[model samples]
Target: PLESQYQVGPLLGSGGFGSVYSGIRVSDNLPVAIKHVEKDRISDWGELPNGTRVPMEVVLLKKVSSGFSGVIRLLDWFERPDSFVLILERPEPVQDLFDFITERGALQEELARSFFWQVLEAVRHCHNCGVLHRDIKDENILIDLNRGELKLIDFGSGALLKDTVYTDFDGTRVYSPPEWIRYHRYHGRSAAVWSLGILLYDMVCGDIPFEHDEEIIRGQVFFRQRVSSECQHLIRWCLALRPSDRPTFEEIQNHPWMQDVLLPQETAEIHLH
Candidate 1:
């Protein structure tokens, strides 16, 4: 309902919550993304128990995603009597990991390990801040290949630290941790951890270990196994049914394969010298 100074151009994407528009700022003439949050998309609105004119999406966007490197940044916001629009910063368009990996077989070990480590850093940051990105899948992980930056996005199902525990059907079934299926809070860490394992496996094996098709995946949970010790151990550690059985992020990060892959040293040269 309100006039925007920026010129909103092509549609970037659309979801249940809002539509993302490619925009160019008038003053600076810089390209940006604007997300228009349709008012009816918000259920509680002014009647929510918290009593806020601000929508839940804006509240969380202000809180957890305020200025994170990987997150879509909110630069400006406009509210009309009928609708709300959020102006956001956009990164380079990323071809989803799914599409990227399909073209290239499992990357060389060094490359895959580097990407995995960066993903861990992102996960650690979000988890430490008490935000659970419930949906972590190949299609959602974006990469800026030119900059060698891997970013995570799509936070529609993310839950704040305060509202951590939820027993619902919200995650990509195959990537979801075993514990989540049982409705337990190994905390939100388990889901991220399990998805991490799946990502690692894909980077090494070239495909998702679990089947996406419902009937096939149902059987995978019971008998599917890993053959690589480094990967198998790591995946099992995160996908453990018992929360306590899972390894801390520190423990996993310090695991031998991860450490050696990231911090390799040529010892033979020193000895020869």
Candidate 2:
């Protein structure tokens, strides 16, 4: 039935572990991306929105898809004896945000501001929808320059949203907050907020603020490249040593730097003035 409903095509990507393929839904010819993961790699299963049990990664993605359109849409899922296949709408951006930033150099504050706003909203929506996207980084975000839009991808490290602290973390080490390193536990919100700051810093500064794990724990953020002072302040607020000090999404939005700003890159993408 899986092969009958979806016509699998050529491999689109393979990242040492999981592999993804381009596919089309047989019924409507809708383009899709099929991600195949080895069963040995999946340590946990989760209850999906449809009441079926599936891999935690696919389940969390399904839970957050409607809560915010910013998340890439999950369409279907199935499991083989050896691998699990997750079928999702294939919305391709020309490049991931990291690729674009590296190739084009650092962005103007206003341009970074636009991208930051979209990511903030997308992440906040996931949290509200009972999903914790443990990995939030430039590599996980797709940027469509023409649409001035951002879409989150790769939920391989996601977990069901929890109000309590998580003692164990599996997200990228660089995006993990110092609080996690210090206490060996973290609440999803604070950790995500910390990662956002690192991403924002990378955007405007052309590189992350900290290098070593010890430097991250100290949380002394300093800009190597020139950036608006206000932008630096906002980034600092997110990277604050105390999770208690990190700004909430609303406060982050209301920050002086996040306020009304005109970006030529954003303006050029839209027809409306």
Candidate 3:
């Protein structure tokens, strides 16, 4: 049975229209995170809520959990006449990527590679689920450093791929694919891979290779033919202008970089600080 009157307690986070709250089930005392989505934001769609909007997110979780562990768990959902609410499992002590990077300066290659593998696994599952997480950025991934666990979150732009070609202003500019940056649409699996490549490269290089240079980075020669040799092949392969040219997630999973890449040994001559 669904419980009514869930207390919207302390604020967890905020988006453009609504905020998330840390709350407890008054009946069982279980902790849950609730996203209070505002109705006005969807008023223009002219479709009434069947109390089913959250089914997509739940479907996303079922698919995500199939390939990845340590992801946030979905427990229940609530619908008011006007609002859609999501009830989530609480994983305490998890920090967003921004905080982790801000404190560590840079991620070690071995650690970074481990996370990249996991994130890809999760993403590969998303692909298999026939959904596209159009928005993939550091800000949306969470890490529990103590447990060495990473979880992907945020569904603001996550969408089904069948019968739909999404063209929307979504995702952070810094992590968008060149195709998406140029065309402003969900450019398919390769676009997601491109964002992943940028993230993986940053994990190793200590900062984004493009450094906020959208125009130059999008140029054919600049990032296409010219880039540091370290992960150049993978970067160009993933960031290909034609989505068809990019390798599939299966190819990425089996690549030499994913299988054997490692952090360079620390030496007195090498300064990471």
Candidate 4:
């Protein structure tokens, strides 16, 4: 009956952390993405209300409320003998940014601007709530078909906001900033900005700006196709060699590229600080 409550289906996909499966809640027949992680695979564990040791990802999921827009909603979680299960709200007709790019190649400036702005808004919300998404890449962002609505997912590589430096590498190296690859130390906010820059480039150019650590450190960047002046400027500013040179989340949100991206109602909802 454990499986009947949420009828598990075939595998959805897998990553370094674990595998995700498509499932349905028997109560309402609502679709959900069920993540399965082995006990030993989780490096960090915290106690739950019932005194069970659950993975840190579960804790983070609970920390972020489902009501938070621009984030994947965590509906429920459970523990099995050998692994843990996380029930995530599954938005139908959803497509991962990676697959979306693969099918459409590079996106137009207007479309890219809208999608990038949504991701930026999501990241801003995450940071404002004292969370740092260590892994911000195409695969982590999911998009809807019609309006290109985006949701940031996969908090397996996330960390709490802190003042101290972080030396441990938890995310994809390709999206890492040059300073981190060179010095092995990074601040959470700066790292997030760097990843956002890389994400923007991938959205507009359909590829990463740098292929290797050396190229990134040397600040070698090129555009495969023409991009608007504002978009190009924002990307270059985010990918600056020095972390201090990059703009804060607030600054990024206010940049010209984001000027007309959000709807009037959406803009009203954003609390500018």
Q: Which window of 10 residues has the lowest lDDT sum in candidate 3?
A: 264-273
- What lDDT would each prediction earn against the true structure? 0.64, 0.82, 0.63, 0.82
By the lDDT metric, which is better: model 1 or model 4? 4
lDDT of 1 by residue, 131-246 (tens): 66777777667666545556676555666644355565355777776555544443666556767777777777777776654422242332233345666567656655555666
What RMSD does each model have against the real structure? 6.2, 2.8, 5.7, 4.3
Error of 3 at 258 (Å): 1.1
Evaluate residue 220 in candidate 3 and report its C-alpha lDDT on the 0 to 100 scale: 47
- For each candidate, give its TM-score against the true structure: 0.75, 0.90, 0.76, 0.92
Give lDDT tens digits, candidate 4, residues 35-60.
98888788767676878777878776
Candidate 1 residues lying further than 4 Å off, grouped into runs, are: 1-3, 16-18, 42-51, 65-68, 80-83, 162-164, 183-186, 212-228, 260-273
Q: For candidate 2, write residues 10-85 as lDDT tens digits.
A: 9877763379898888899888888998988887688755687778888787778774557778887888988898
Candidate 2's displacement at residue 156, Å, is 1.4
TM-score of decoy 4 = 0.92
Question: Against the true structure, candidate 2 has what lDDT?
Answer: 0.82
Cα RMSD of predicted structure 3: 5.7
Residue 133, candidate 4: Cα error in Å is 1.1
Q: Tell me the lDDT of candidate 1.
A: 0.64
In angstroms, the error of model 1 at 101 is: 1.8
lDDT of 3 by residue, 98-147 (tens): 66677775675556667777788767666776766766767767765445
